[PDB]
Amino acid sequence: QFPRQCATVEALRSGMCCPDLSPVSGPGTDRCGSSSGRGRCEAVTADSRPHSPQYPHDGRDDREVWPLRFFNRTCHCNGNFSGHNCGTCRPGWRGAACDQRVLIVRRNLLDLSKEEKNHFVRALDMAKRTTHPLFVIATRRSEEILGPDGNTPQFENISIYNYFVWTHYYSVKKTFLGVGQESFGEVDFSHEGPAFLTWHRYHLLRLEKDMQEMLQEPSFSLPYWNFATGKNVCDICTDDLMGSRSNFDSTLISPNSVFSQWRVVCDSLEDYDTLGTLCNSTEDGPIRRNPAGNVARPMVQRLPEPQDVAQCLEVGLFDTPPFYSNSTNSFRNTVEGYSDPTGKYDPAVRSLHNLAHLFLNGTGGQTHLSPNDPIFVLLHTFTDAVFDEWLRRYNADISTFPLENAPIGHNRQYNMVPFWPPVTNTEMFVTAPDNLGYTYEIQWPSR
Numbered sequence: 001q002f003p004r005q006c007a008t009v010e011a012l013r014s015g016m017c018c019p020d021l022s023p024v025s026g027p028g029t030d031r032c033g034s035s036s037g038r039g040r041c042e043a044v045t046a047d048s049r050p051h052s053p054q055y056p057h058d059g060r061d062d063r064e065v066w067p068l069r070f071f072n073r074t075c076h077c078n079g080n081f082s083g084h085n086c087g088t089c090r091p092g093w094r095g096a097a098c099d100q101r102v103l104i105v106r107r108n109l110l111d112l113s114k115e116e117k118n119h120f121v122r123a124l125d126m127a128k129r130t131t132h133p134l135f136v137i138a139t140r141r142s143e144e145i146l147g148p149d150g151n152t153p154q155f156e157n158i159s160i161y162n163y164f165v166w167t168h169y170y171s172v173k174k175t176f177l178g179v180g181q182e183s184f185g186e187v188d189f190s191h192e193g194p195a196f197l198t199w200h201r202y203h204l205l206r207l208e209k210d211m212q213e214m215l216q217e218p219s220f221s222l223p224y225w226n227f228a229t230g231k232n233v234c235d236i237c238t239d240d241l242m243g244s245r246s247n248f249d250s251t252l253i254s255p256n257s258v259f260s261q262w263r264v265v266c267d268s269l270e271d272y273d274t275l276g277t278l279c280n281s282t283e284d285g286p287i288r289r290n291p292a293g294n295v296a297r298p299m300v301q302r303l304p305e306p307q308d309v310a311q312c313l314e315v316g317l318f319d320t321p322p323f324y325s326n327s328t329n330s331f332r333n334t335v336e337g338y339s340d341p342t343g344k345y346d347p348a349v350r351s352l353h354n355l356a357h358l359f360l361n362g363t364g365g366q367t368h369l370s371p372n373d374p375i376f377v378l379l380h381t382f383t384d385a386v387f388d389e390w391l392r393r394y395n396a397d398i399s400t401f402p403l404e405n406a407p408i409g410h411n412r413q414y415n416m417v418p419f420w421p422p423v424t425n426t427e428m429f430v431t432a433p434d435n436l437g438y439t440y441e442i443q444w445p446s447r
């Protein structure tokens with residue numbers, strides 16, 4: 001989850017992740033672009049406030065108070081600069097002085113031209129195969145991060161797209177259970193709590209930026225899938241888009257799609273939970289997808305109705321106690337899909353976002369794997385657009401987003417795990433057009 005240049009013995013020893021930008025006088029000369037005034041190496045701010053109760057709780061999880069288990073100093077950027085070394089710009093700005101406004105437009109995948117559809121599928125396929133230029137991932141927990149001989153960092157290179165899968169995995173995986181140790185209650189830093197929407201928004205912003213850099217196309221934008229159609233089919237499961245069903249195995253993707261060649265990451269839960277390792281960059285096994293084919297669970301065999309979206313946008317409180325999968329009259333819990341579209345909780349219901357995932361009946365609907373299916377991108381940009389419209393309706397009213405006692409990872413000033421550099425739920429809780437450099441071309445149902 002860290003810049004390559006800080007995944008070292010010295011950097012972990014110093015507790016500093018403050019890489020050079022333009023070090024002309026030898027190493028360590030231009031930390032955070034300080035020599036041009038772009039930023040400075042400073043102490044990190046991490047959320048101190050208490051999280052909702054956990055039984056048991058020994059507090060040894062590396063994700064608590066992220067990222068202080070690893071680094072306590074980072075680059076704090078000035079003005080409109082940003083990035084791990086202050087070498088780029090805040091979203092909505094570009095140029096060497098980061099003084100030129102930019103606005104990109106996220107569009108319905110089906111409204112794209114034939115040529116733009118092909119461009120998008122080629123870009124995703126390239127992200128799947130190209131090494132992330134900046135980040136490396138840990139294969140081991142903190143206490144074993146330097147290897148058996150105490151001098152070998154257990155980090156691996158990873159593709160742009162696989163890094164997107166890994167960060168989601170790391171946010172949901174179980175805290176490691178030794179011998180004789182009673183099983184902990186489950187935690188989730190990115191679902192089942194108010195950080196659901198701010199977490200997934202940043203996730204997307206980072207993938208978009210990585211792909212813009214990979215293509216050298218500053219204007220590249222992620223499109224969205226309008227899943228609120230009521231349909232009994234996936235209307236983007238064609239061989240020019242996300243891939244139709246294989247005629248040889250109805251849970252596989254058509255071999256006339258590039259996505260039939262993708263192999264998934266993070267699918268060895270049993271090894272992670274027994275050996276106490278983390279997901280590494282080795283791929284293993286194809287995407288499984290089978291839209292509408294969950295015969296056991298019939299409620300999951302049709303997609304959300306258009307009016308499900310108009311209804312959830314009436315729910316006027318962002319979230320409500322106890323800030324969890326059983327909140328009621330919570331906009332967040334409604335869009336996430338644990339409560340019906342009017343606001344009303346009910347443990348049997350699956351709506352909106354959760355329904356879209358479960359409809360896929362495969363890789364796309366297991367929480368540790370789901371981003372391995374690229375439909376995840378398009379389902380999350382749609383979910384984000386609903387979030388953005390709610391932010392516009394209700395003047396970005398953050399007041400019900402709890403400062404304390406939310407499930408771990410979900411307090412308002414938590415650094416969303418495991419993103420780098422540190423970034424709070426607060427920073428994503430803004431209207432995108434004016435604050436984050438992007439808008440959606442979309443029409444809402446008028447009820």
Ligand SMILES: *[C@@H]1O[C@H](CO[C@@H]2O[C@@H](C)[C@@H](O)[C@@H](O)[C@@H]2O)[C@@H](O[C@@H]2O[C@H](CO)[C@@H](O[C@@H]3O[C@H](CO[C@H]4O[C@H](CO)[C@@H](O)[C@H](O)[C@@H]4O)[C@@H](O)[C@H](O[C@H]4O[C@H](CO)[C@@H](O)[C@H](O)[C@@H]4O)[C@@H]3O)[C@H](O)[C@H]2NC(C)=O)[C@H](O)[C@H]1NC(C)=O
Pocket residue numbers: 012013014015016068069070071072
């Ligand atoms: C910011 O980070 C600095 C730590 O760097 C890493 O990054 C953070 C994020 C964590 O991951 C951290 O674990 C990493 O090390 C941090 O400075 C570091 O602070 C630690 C904790 O105080 C220092 O270690 C302690 O040093 C004292 C005194 O130094 C002696 O060193 C040797 C012995 O090894 C001999 O020369 C003498 O005995 C010296 O007196 C030790 O007494 C102490 O040992 C005891 O505590 C540890 C656990 O803390 C036990 O395991 C031992 O058994 C002992 O009971 C520690 O080893 C470390 O030197 C220091 N590093 C540097 C480079 O300065 C800084 O404090 C953080 N800043 C803030 C604001 O938190």
Ligand SMILES: *[C@@H]1O[C@H](CO)[C@@H](O[C@@H]2O[C@H](CO)[C@@H](O[C@@H]3O[C@H](CO[C@H]4O[C@H](CO)[C@@H](O)[C@H](O)[C@@H]4O)[C@@H](O)[C@H](O)[C@@H]3O)[C@H](O)[C@H]2NC(C)=O)[C@H](O)[C@H]1NC(C)=O
Pocket residue numbers: 293294295296297361362363365366
């Ligand atoms: C995608 O959809 C598939 C079909 O809906 C999902 O598979 C089904 O998942 C359910 C829920 O876990 C399984 O239910 C269990 O069934 C066993 C009994 O097993 C046998 O059931 C029938 C006979 O009744 C038999 O024909 C099957 O071959 C099984 O051997 C119960 O004892 C358990 O308590 C539990 O209810 C189904 O078995 C399973 N069905 C099939 C056809 O596999 C699949 O999980 C979905 N995948 C994803 C990722 O969403």
Ligand SMILES: *[C@@H]1O[C@H](CO)[C@@H](O[C@@H]2O[C@H](CO)[C@@H](O[C@@H]3O[C@H](CO)[C@@H](O)[C@H](O)[C@@H]3O)[C@H](O)[C@H]2NC(C)=O)[C@H](O)[C@H]1NC(C)=O
Pocket residue numbers: 139268271272277279280281282284
């Ligand atoms: C990266 O992650 C993969 C997935 O966890 C690792 O591969 C897996 O490693 C385990 C443990 O070494 C293998 O299990 C063992 O297999 C032997 C031989 O069949 C068996 O006798 C043992 O009882 C044990 O179960 C597992 O098969 C293997 N799976 C795959 C896909 O190869 C891999 O080692 C990780 N890499 C690093 C650098 O940690």
Ligand SMILES: *[C@@H]1O[C@H](CO[C@@H]2O[C@@H](C)[C@@H](O)[C@@H](O)[C@@H]2O)[C@@H](O[C@@H]2O[C@H](CO)[C@@H](O)[C@H](O)[C@H]2NC(C)=O)[C@H](O)[C@H]1NC(C)=O
Pocket residue numbers: 131132133134157
């Ligand atoms: C992990 O990757 C680094 C960096 O790779 C470079 O940048 C990537 C984004 C991609 O573009 C690669 O094709 C690039 O090569 C590798 O770094 C090289 O490592 C060797 C020795 O390990 C060193 O001699 C080279 O000079 C390094 N180059 C740079 C730019 O740092 C590294 O090897 C990879 N690690 C493993 C285990 O494969």
Ligand SMILES: *[C@@H]1O[C@H](CO[C@@H]2O[C@@H](C)[C@@H](O)[C@@H](O)[C@@H]2O)[C@@H](O[C@@H]2O[C@H](CO)[C@@H](O)[C@H](O)[C@H]2NC(C)=O)[C@H](O)[C@H]1NC(C)=O
Pocket residue numbers: 052053054185322324326407408
């Ligand atoms: C809603 O469900 C919770 C479920 O338990 C916890 O909820 C979150 C805090 C989550 O982050 C996890 O730690 C847990 O799964 C119910 O919590 C219970 O609350 C009662 C009353 O306050 C308490 O005595 C219980 O011990 C809690 N449960 C556990 C597992 O300890 C909560 O009551 C539910 N509320 C509604 C309105 O249904």
Ligand SMILES: *[C@@H]1O[C@H](CO)[C@@H](O)[C@H](O)[C@H]1NC(C)=O
Pocket residue numbers: 079080092434435
């Ligand atoms: C930088 O960008 C923000 C984002 O909208 C803008 O509001 C602000 O006025 C800008 N300030 C500077 C330092 O130019």
Ligand SMILES: [Zn+2]
Pocket residue numbers: 051057059064
């Ligand atoms: Zn804790």
Ligand SMILES: [Zn+2]
Pocket residue numbers: 168190191200
């Ligand atoms: Zn998710």
Ligand SMILES: [Zn+2]
Pocket residue numbers: 119215217
């Ligand atoms: Zn291009």
Ligand SMILES: [Zn+2]
Pocket residue numbers: 230305
């Ligand atoms: Zn209908």
Ligand SMILES: [Zn+2]
Pocket residue numbers: 353357380
């Ligand atoms: Zn999701």
